[PDB]
Structures are given as structure tokens and as C-alpha cells.
């Protein structure tokens, strides 16, 4: 059962295709048209089913020719109304009928950002974007919203014809609308079943540049160049992945560059990766985020979790293949080198959530939780953290490699549990389970806090960053004059962002050691996103007044939440800035990404 959804479950009936007929208005912030869905029933003498909303407003219903009763039941908060439909002829098993629900979303939809002219890049024109994972497609369209039903999907979008619509399928020819000729239709094909949060829908002033055999990148006119050099590893990277996990299924890997209010540092979408603009260094330095793009196309959307309760299955393995691919690239130390850091990463998030806390345990029960309160590093590190261990236990990369693959052909175009993955993971290697069975799976699964075993890492390139930040927190005044430019010299941006995060661990620091870190390092010249928020942190909670306008535009210039988040919370933790986070996101909130806002406005107790 998908206790997210209010849907009938894949048991009652299942959706097998989706065809959505819509057109994109920027003048009302809607999305109005009609999703024809292609419903299978599971169920002998089956006459009504339910679907998923979040402030729809229905039209009407229509099956074979004409219209049928439908309810809207009342909101249950974030999961929105379920809308139970009347079906004027009872099904037998296996039997299929098309629905076509007429709709409109909300300008509100939790799914969506509508963004005016002057939020972009080219200021001429507005841009629409959609983020559906985990449970915004009902916000977009009256579906069975969960992971545990997987259809296929065509769409036909019409939209002004001086703007490009583009989704996650592959592009299937445009034409002048008949009814609108200020308006095009872009068609869309997705031949690959996939679940519903994988829809995906951009309207914006787009250009593309291709950067491989089958990628081209999107963004606006002025992203293009840098976006083309910055991810110009991509086709490489899809070939290892293609080693690791099998063929690639789906075509095109395309990728589109967003506004930088988008939420995450990337979307799997099919066929068209979304990515953060913050990822734009400059120097390539932040591509494990395509390679973890990338790895979905395996896991999560080729073998996909069948509730939410067990997101840590495509996110962990996800990440699992994603230092698999840098370590190709970059050499095995560098794989341990990031590999200690996500460990690092769960270290923070089970001290800020604490040790005991339910978000902190690998399975989580979703039944009552908002998914994106829930959402956190926890099934990313602790999940990547369980492969790792595993990994070694059972003899190394290349071994465990061959279960990734062969894990990958096993559950492909499925959704799977928790036990679905073990059980499989027992009969692969079924000449090993003496070891298997000296693993606390209790306690990996299910327990809160830190996991109860740590694998083992090379720590080669580590050392130096671990060297540097004990010689800062360990200084006294009198130690400040010797700390110089050249102590970065051998080091990567990454050892350097894991210098801070080393740093930031021990934080606050003095706010002497911090204006002398400034005066010998220059960290605020420094324009690497992630290099950039780990010093504002440091810096916030270090006390240091002259980074407060720093972190406030950081904060607000950008919205990825995982930079967002933090910078907000460390502001209004600092009773200097409190006052300003506060006014600065009041400001701000009705032109955020609406879960962003939500999120923020939780974060900081307001309204
Ligand atoms: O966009 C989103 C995509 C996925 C999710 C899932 C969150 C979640 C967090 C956990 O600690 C455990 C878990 O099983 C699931 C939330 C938002
Ligand atoms: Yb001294
Ligand atoms: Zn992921």
C-alpha cells in the first residue's frame, strides 16, 4: 500500500498510458486541457475507482462519448482531495477503458513555478517549470500518484509560439495551434513506462547546443555557452554508466539548465536531466550531479521504489553508481575520497535531526509526513553508506558491480520494496550468505541515528584537508601569521569545500580566525556554489557581521534548497541577522518555488 496516495492501488487497477492535451496560459499562471488516461482493471466487476488531486478544478468526465458522476472528497492536507469517478459500466479483470478528465490547475499547484519576465534571464519573456517527485503530479493532473503504477505517455502542449515547451520524452514534432495562431503545439512521445513523478514540463524562451552524440543542452540564450562547457563530461560519463548498469533505454540524454530557483541540484526526468544553474563553476568541478542524473536512468527509473517509504533504493544506489562512474573517471582514491564525505554528510544530518529521530532511519514510515519534510541526506549517505559496507564485505567493487547489474536487468520497468532488494540480494549471492547473515539488518533498515558499523576508506586525499582544518581550530592568536595563500596550493576545490566541511563541523570558529581565513584565502572571491555556502556558513555562525549581505543575496539569489535551507536557518540562529532572514523571506516568499517557501517559512517558525 502507498500511504502517499489516495488513489486505488495497482491492485484495484492500473494506469497504462497517459495522453495529455493541454495548453499553457501565462496570463491566468494555468495549465488547462484534458488527461485521457488508459486504465487496466485488476479487479473482477470493478465500478468505480479513485484518482489523486491537489486543487484541480474538474470540468467533467467522459468515457465513450459521455459524461460520468465523479466526487471530489475532502482535502487531506498535502495529499491533496482524492476524486472517486463512477464508471458507467462494470470491468472484468484485465479489462481497459480510457477516462478523460477536463481540468485546470490552481496558479498555487505545489508541482509548479511560474516565473514573470524579470525573474529570467532574458527578461523578455516568462518562463514555467515543473518539479513532480515526489507527490506534486496530482497538483498537475488527476493521476494515481504513486511509484507503484508505471505508464506510458504522449502530450501535446500548446503554448505562446515564441516560447519552446520541452518534457521528459522524446520531442515528437510542432505545429501552429488551429485554435490559436499566436500559439504552438509541441508533441511529446514516452515509449518507456515510467511512474507519474518522472512528467515533466518546461515553457520558457529555449535555446540548445549539442554536446554529444545524443545530448543536447537547454537554457535560456545567455546559459548556453557555459552550460555547453560545464558538462561537456556527460557523454563519457553515460558510457561508463552503460558499462555499469546495462543499455540505456531511453534515447536522448538531454539536459536542461533552469532558473536558479529551482529546488534541487537535479531531476532524473526522462530523456531531459533538469539542473541547477548553481552548478555552473566554471571549471566542471561539480559534475558528480550529472553522473548521479545520469545513474537514475538505471536506478529509480528503470527499477523504481514502490513507495516513498523506500526512496533510499534509487537514491542510495544511485549514489552507489554515481562514485562508481567518478572513480572511472578520476581514479579509485578520489571514489573514497567522496565516499568519506557523504558519511561526513550523514554525520550532520543525524546530529541536526538527532540520534534518535524517525527521518534518520533508512525505511521510513510516510503514512502521516509531507515526503518533502521528510526529505533529507539520510537515505542518499546512510543508503550509500549500507552498498559500501556491503561492497567490502562481499569482495569488492567488481563483485558488487556484478549485482548492480545484474539487480538493474532483474527489476527493470518494476517498483520494488525494501524486501524485494534483499531477497534478491540473498539469491545472488547465495554462496555468501553466512556473511550476508552477520549483518544487523535490523539496525541498517530500521534503527535510527548513525549506521552500526562504518566501512572502511582510504583517506589519501582527505588527510591534507583534515590536516589543515585541525591546524585552524587548534590556533591561538599568536598562530594566525603563519597561515598563507600557499597552504591551498595542492589542493583540488574539492579538498578545499572539504576543508570547510571539516571546518564547518567545529564551527563557530573565533571570528579572528575567520576575518584571517579571509585575509590569506579570499574564500569570498570564490564562486563555487558549494565552496561558496559551506564558507557563508562558517562565516554566519562564526559570528562575522560582514557576511550577513553575502548570505542574504546567497540565499535569496539562488533557491536551491540545499544552499536556501541552511543559509535562512543559520541567518535567523544569528541575533544580528534574525530580524533581516525573517523580512528578506517575507519579501521574498510569493515569488519562491512554493515548496521551497513552504519549507523555509517551517524552518524559520514564520507565519
Ligand atoms: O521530492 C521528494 C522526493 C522524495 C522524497 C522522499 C523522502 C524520504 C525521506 C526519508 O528519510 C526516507 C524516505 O523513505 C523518503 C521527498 C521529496
Ligand atoms: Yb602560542
Ligand atoms: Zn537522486
Not at 123 to 149: G, M, N, W
Not at 567 to 592: C, G, I, N, P
Request: proline share 6%.
Amino acid at each position: 500500500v502507498d500511504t502517499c496516495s489516495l488513489a486505488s492501488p495497482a491492485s484495484v487497477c492500473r494506469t497504462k498510458h497517459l495522453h495529455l492535451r493541454c495548453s499553457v496560459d501565462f496570463t491566468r499562471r494555468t495549465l488547462t486541457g484534458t488527461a485521457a488516461l488508459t486504465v487496466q482493471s485488476q479487479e473482477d466487476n470493478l465500478r468505480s475507482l479513485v484518482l489523486d488531486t491537489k486543487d484541480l478544478t474538474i470540468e467533467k468526465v467522459v468515457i465513450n462519448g459521455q459524461e460520468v458522476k465523479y466526487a471530489l472528497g475532502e482535502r487531506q492536507s498535502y495529499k491533496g482531495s482524492p476524486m472517486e469517478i463512477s464508471l458507467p459500466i462494470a470491468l472484468s479483470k484485465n479489462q481497459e477503458i480510457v477516462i478523460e478528465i477536463s481540468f485546470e490547475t490552481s496558479p498555487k499547484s505545489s508541482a509548479l513555478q511560474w516565473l514573470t519576465p524579470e525573474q529570467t534571464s532574458g527578461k523578455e519573456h516568462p518562463y514555467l517549470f515543473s518539479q513532480c517527485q515526489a507527490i506534486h503530479c496530482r497538483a498537475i493532473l488527476p493521476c494515481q500518484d504513486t511509484p507503484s503504477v508505471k505508464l506510458t505517455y504522449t502530450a501535446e502542449v500548446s503554448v505562446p509560439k515564441e516560447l519552446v515547451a520541452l518534457m521528459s520524452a522524446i520531442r515528437d514534432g510542432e505545429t501552429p495551434d488551429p485554435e490559436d495562431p499566436s500559439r504552438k503545439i509541441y508533441k511529446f512521445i514516452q515509449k518507456v513506462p515510467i511512474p507519474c513523478y518522472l512528467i515533466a514540463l518546461v515553457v520558457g524562451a529555449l535555446e540548445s547546443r549539442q554536446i554529444g552524440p545524443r545530448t543536447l543542452v537547454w537554457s535560456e540564450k545567455e546559459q548556453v555557452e557555459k552550460s555547453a562547457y560545464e558538462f561537456s563530461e556527460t557523454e563519457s560519463m553515460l558510457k561508463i554508466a552503460e558499462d555499469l548498469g546495462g543499455p540505456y533505454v531511453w534515447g536522448q540524454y538531454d539536459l536542461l539548465v533552469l532558473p536558479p530557483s529551482f529546488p534541487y541540484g537535479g531531476m532524473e526526468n526522462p530523456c531531459l536531466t533538469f539542473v541547477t544553474p548553481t552548478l555552473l563553476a566554471g571549471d566542471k568541478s561539480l559534475s558528480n550531479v550529472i553522473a548521479h542524473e545520469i545513474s537514475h536512468s538505471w536506478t529509480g527509473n528503470l527499477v523504481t521504489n514502490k513507495t516513498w517509504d523506500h526512496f533510499w533504493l534509487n537514491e542510495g544506489h544511485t549514489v552507489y553508481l554515481e562514485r562508481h562512474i567518478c572513480g572511472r573517471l578520476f581514479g579509485e582514491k578520489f571514489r573514497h575520497f567522496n565516499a568519506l564525505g557523504g558519511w561526513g554528510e550523514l554525520q550532520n544530518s543525524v546530529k541536526t535531526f538527532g540520534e534518535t529521530h524517525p527521518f534518520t532511519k533508512l525505511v521510513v514510515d510516510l503514512t502521516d509526513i509531507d515526503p518533502d519534510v521528510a526529505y533529507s541526506s539520510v537515505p542518499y549517505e546512510k543508503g550509500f553508506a549500507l552498498l559500501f559496507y556491503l561492497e567490502q564485505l562481499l569482495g569488492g567493487p567488481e563483485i558488487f558491480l556484478g549485482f548492480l547489474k545484474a539487480y538493474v536487468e532483474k527489476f527493470s520497468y518494476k517498483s520494488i520494496t525494501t524486501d524485494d532488494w534483499k531477497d534478491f540480494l540473498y539469491s545472488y549471492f547465495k554462496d555468501k550468505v553466512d556473511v550476508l547473515n552477520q549483518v544487523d539488518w535490523n539496525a541498517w533498515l530500521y534503527s535510527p541515528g548513525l549506521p552500526p558499523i562504518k566501512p572502511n576508506y582510504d583517506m589519501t586525499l582527505t588527510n591534507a584537508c583534515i590536516a589543515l582544518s585541525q591546524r585552524w581550530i587548534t590556533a591561538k592568536e599568536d598562530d594566525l601569521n603563519s597561515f598563507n595563500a600557499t597552504d591551498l596550493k595542492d589542493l583540488s576545490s574539492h579538498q578545499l569545500n572539504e576543508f570547510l566541511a571539516q571546518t564547518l563541523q567545529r564551527a563557530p570558529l573565533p571570528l579572528g580566525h575567520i576575518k584571517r581565513m579571509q585575509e590569506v584565502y579570499n574564500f569570498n572571491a570564490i564562486n563555487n556554489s558549494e565552496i561558496r555556502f559551506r564558507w557563508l556558513r562558517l562565516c554566519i555562525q562564526s559570528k562575522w557581521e560582514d557576511a550577513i549581505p553575502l548570505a542574504l543575496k546567497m540565499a535569496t539569489e539562488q533557491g536551491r534548497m540545499k544552499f536556501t535551507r541552511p543559509l535562512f536557518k543559520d541567518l535567523a540562529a544569528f541575533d544580528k541577522s534574525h530580524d533581516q532572514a525573517v523580512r528578506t523571506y517575507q519579501e521574498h516568499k510569493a515569488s519562491m518555488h512554493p515548496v521551497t517557501a513552504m519549507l523555509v517559512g517551517k524552518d524559520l517558525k514564520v507565519d
